[PDB]
C-alpha cells in the first residue's frame, strides 16, 4: 500500500509526458491542415504565428514548423 501510492504519482508523471508529446503532434497536424487548405485553393495564412490554438496545441513556436517542413519533404521522398 506504499507502492500503490507511488504508482498514483508515477502515472501522473507519465500522463504529463503524454501531454507534451501529443501537443507536439497536434501542432503538426494543424500545420498540415493549414497547408492543405492553402493548397486546395483557400485563403488562410500558413505562418506559424497564425495557426489556431485550442489548449490541445498551445502557442506555436518556430521550431514546430521546421519539424513539419523536414517531415513533409521526408514523406514526399518516400513514395
Amino acid at each position: 500500500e506504499q507502492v500503490q501510492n507511488q504508482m498514483n504519482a508515477w502515472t501522473k508523471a507519465q500522463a504529463k509526458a503524454l501531454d507534451d508529446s501529443m501537443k507536439s503532434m497536434n501542432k503538426l497536424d494543424v500545420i498540415d491542415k493549414q497547408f492543405q487548405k492553402r493548397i486546395n485553393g483557400e485563403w488562410v495564412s500558413t505562418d506559424f504565428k497564425d495557426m489556431p490554438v485550442n489548449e490541445n496545441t498551445g502557442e506555436f513556436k518556430h521550431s514546430d514548423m521546421v519539424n513539419y517542413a523536414n517531415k513533409k519533404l521526408a514523406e514526399i521522398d518516400s513514395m
Partner: protein, 47 residues
C-alpha cells in the same frame, strides 16, 4: 490519471468571399462591326 489532451484539433476557415464576376473582354469595335456588317470599318467609310 486521465490524459488532459484530446486529439480534437482547432479549426480555422478561409476568408472566402465571392462578390460579382466580371464581364468578359467585349469584342473590339472593329471586329464588332465585322461579324455584324460583314465588312470592315475602312470598307464602310469608302461609300
Amino acid at each position: 490519471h486521465k490524459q488532459k489532451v484530446t486529439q480534437e484539433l482547432p479549426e480555422s476557415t478561409s476568408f472566402d468571399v465571392k462578390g460579382i464576376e466580371q464581364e468578359a473582354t467585349a469584342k473590339p469595335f472593329a471586329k464588332d462591326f465585322w461579324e455584324t456588317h460583314g465588312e470592315t470599318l475602312d470598307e464602310y467609310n469608302s461609300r
